[PDB]
Design a protein around this ligand. Structure first.
Ligand code: MFU
Ligand code: MFU
Ligand code: MFU
Ligand code: MFU
Length: 342
């Protein structure tokens, strides 16, 4: 009961330029970047980071401006590689050990320490962190228990601490979160029920209320959200549609959540909040023919950009403009789906 994953991870460089990371046909992580912020078409082209990947990569900027990418290696350990100055000079790959059985996801703590979450060999959630802002060493791997059947998804909550969500072996959504307590720094796992058939994705509304999206057992998009910042949750509610990938979500320029997914015609579809109350738009097609979940990012000018694999395994993209969306164009490449779950 898994849905098609995204095939890249995107981030902005410190200067605003988007950069994407994916696994090529030779099983290496490759990357491609805007040569100046906000451009429609001026990209570097694809450059290899070498070696061998066995998961979807994940990138996050450090609090000093350096991008850092994470992937599972051929040994099933977590590996990482970083810019040595903002925008350039990759370190080469170094091991963070462990055995992971999901794709890794990255969080940044309010103090500037990166932290990675992944499923372990015992199907529990594990995590590992920088011990100082934007600097090694990293901690040992530590277990947060649970039984996971999806990638974890993480966001900062209204208390400024991480909250992590995953599907469990009852096919329901569960979460855990970090507190200020020394004795119980992380909560017990708590259920939000549901039957979900994709990876879940969490995001925060502009006012701090978390919201989670996932495909349901009827292949519609479903969602569940907090009734106030760091409060309890609604029931699961349907946004209808027929989604044939994991959903992706980002806040738009209007401060409203906007969800993207592949549809049953293999086009890219999207849907957005139209009020603060639970009002949403109609599902709306952006056309295209895609062979992955979408990945959504935002340019320095505030406009969204969506990436997805095309019919020939190249990376396609479509950009929001001041009044519309652009045409679909190709960034080339030959991407595989190396997702560690499926
Ligand atoms: C360090 O421990 C190893 O890596 C963790 C991330 C888990 O997969 C655990 O089951 C495994 O033995
Ligand atoms: C310079 O890069 C910093 O130190 C390295 C040794 C790694 O621990 C990395 O996570 C961190 O960003
Ligand atoms: C030092 O790092 C902090 O404390 C550890 C014991 C973990 O609970 C981790 O989530 C947190 O980031
Ligand atoms: C709460 O409802 C349950 O979970 C939703 C996310 C959907 O999968 C629905 O079909 C199922 O009955």
């Amino acid at each position: 009961w898994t849905a098609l994953s995204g095939v890249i991870s995107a981030a902005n460089n410190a200067d605003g330029r988007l950069e994407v990371f994916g696994v090529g046909t030779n099983n290496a992580v490759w990357h491609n970047w805007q040569t100046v912020p906000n451009t429609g078409s001026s990209w570097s082209g694809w450059h290899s980071l070498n070696e061998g990947a066995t998961s979807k990569p994940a990138v996050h900027i450090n609090s000093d401006g350096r991008l850092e990418v994470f992937v599972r290696g051929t040994d099933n350990a977590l590996w990482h590689n970083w810019q040595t100055v903002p925008g350039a000079g990759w370190s080469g790959w170094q091991s963070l050990g462990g055995q992971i059985t999901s794709n890794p996801v990255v969080y940044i703590n309010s103090d500037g320490r990166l932290e990675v979450f992944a499923r372990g060999a015992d199907n529990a959630l594990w995590h590992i962190w920088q011990t100082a802002p934007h600097a090694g060493p990293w901690s040992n791997w530590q277990s947060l228990n649970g039984v996971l059947t999806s990638d974890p998804t993480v966001y900062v909550n209204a208390s400024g601490r991480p909250e992590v969500f995953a599907r469990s072996n009852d096919y329901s959504l569960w979460y855990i979160k970090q507190t200020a307590s020394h004795t119980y720094p992380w909560t017990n796992w708590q259920s939000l029920s549901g039957v979900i058939t994709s990876n879940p994705v969490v995001i925060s509304n502009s006012d701090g209320r978390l919201e989670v999206f996932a495909r349901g057992s009827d292949n519609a998009l479903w969602h569940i959200w907090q009734v106030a910042p760091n409060a309890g949750w609604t029931n699961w509610r349907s946004l209808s549609g027929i989604i044939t990938s994991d959903p992706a979500v980002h806040i738009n320029a209007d401060g409203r959540l906007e969800v993207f997914a592949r549809g049953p015609d293999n086009a890219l579809w999207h849907i957005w909040q139209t009020a603060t109350s639970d009002a949403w738009s109609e599902w709306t097609s952006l056309s295209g023919v895609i062979t992955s979940a979408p990945t959504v990012a935002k340019n320095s000018d505030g406009w969204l950009e969506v990436f997805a694999r095309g019919a020939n395994n190249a990376l396609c993209h479509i950009q929001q403009t001041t009044s519309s969306w652009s045409t679909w164009t190709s960034l080339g490449g030959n991407l595989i789906d190396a997702s560690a779950i499926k």
